[PDB]
Amino acid sequence: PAEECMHASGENYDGKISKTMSGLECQAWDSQSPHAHGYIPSKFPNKNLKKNYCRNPDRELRPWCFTTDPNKRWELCDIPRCT
Amino acid sequence: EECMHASGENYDGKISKTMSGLECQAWDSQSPHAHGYIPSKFPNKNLKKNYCRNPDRELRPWCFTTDPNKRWELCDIPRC
Amino acid sequence: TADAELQRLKNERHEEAELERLKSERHDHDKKEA
C-alpha cells in the first residue's frame, strides 16, 4: 500500500484517504456532480486522480478533493506528515 | 440585457437598488459598509459602479446598501 | 501546458472558495445582527 502521509505537501501522495479535514466525503474525480470541474483524470495522468482519493495535483497546500456537499466545492484533506 | 435566465450569475445590467428600494453602495466603496467584494480582487465578476450582481452563487443578485443599518439585501431583477 | 492549466484551475478554486466564505459571512452577519 502507498504510505498514508506526506513528506512535503503531498505532490507524491497516492494513498486512499477520501474524506476532507471536516469529514465530508470526497467527490470522485471522474464525476462532474455535484461540482463541475476541470481536473479530468485522463487529462492529467501523472497526477493519479483516482476514485475519490485526496490528491495534490496542483501545488496546493496539501492534498484536497471536491466534496459531495453542494455547498462546499472543495476542501483540504488531513494528511499527516511523514516522520 | 436587463433580465436573468437563472439566478443572475451572468447579470450585467444597471439596476442599482435592492428589493426594498434601497440604493446600492458602490462596490469600490467601503462606506458605509466595509466589505471584501473588492472589484480588483474579483475582476471577472463585473462588480461595477453600484449595480446589483451575483458573484458568489447567491439566490439572486444583491448589493451592499447605502443604509448604514442594512448591510446588504437581494435585488429584484426581472426574469427573462 | 498541463502545469499552467493546473495552476489556472487552482487560482479559480481559490477565488470561488473566497466568494463562498464571503457569502457565508454575509449571512452570519445578518443572523448576529437580527
Side-chain angles (χ1 to χ4, degrees), chain A residues 34-69:
Chain A
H35 303 104
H37 67 88
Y39 293 84
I40 307 309
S42 67
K43 182 172 176 183
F44 304 108
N46 291 324
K47 305 306 182 189
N48 300 321
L49 302 179
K50 298 159 176 184
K51 299 203 171 193
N52 67 331
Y53 300 154
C54 299
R55 290 292 182 263
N56 189 358
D58 54 357
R59 299 194 287 274
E60 186 50 85
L61 213 56
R62 58 184 188 262
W64 58 273
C65 63
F66 295 101
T67 92
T68 58
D69 188 338

Side-chain angles (χ1 to χ4, degrees), chain B residues 8 10-48 50-68:
Chain B
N10 295 309
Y11 179 67
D12 198 33
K14 302 190 294 191
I15 293 170
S16 67
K17 68 174 184 176
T18 72
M19 66 98 70
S20 79
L22 290 173
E23 192 68 16
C24 293
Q25 175 179 319
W27 298 100
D28 68 0
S29 174
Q30 293 282 307
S31 163
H33 304 292
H35 66 88
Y37 293 82
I38 307 308
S40 64
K41 178 177 171 185
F42 300 109
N44 293 323
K45 299 303 184 188
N46 298 318
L47 302 178
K48 192 69 233 83
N50 67 329
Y51 300 151
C52 299
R53 290 293 181 263
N54 190 357
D56 53 356
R57 302 268 270 283
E58 187 51 272
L59 292 184
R60 305 285 190 276
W62 58 273
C63 63
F64 296 101
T65 95
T66 56
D67 187 340

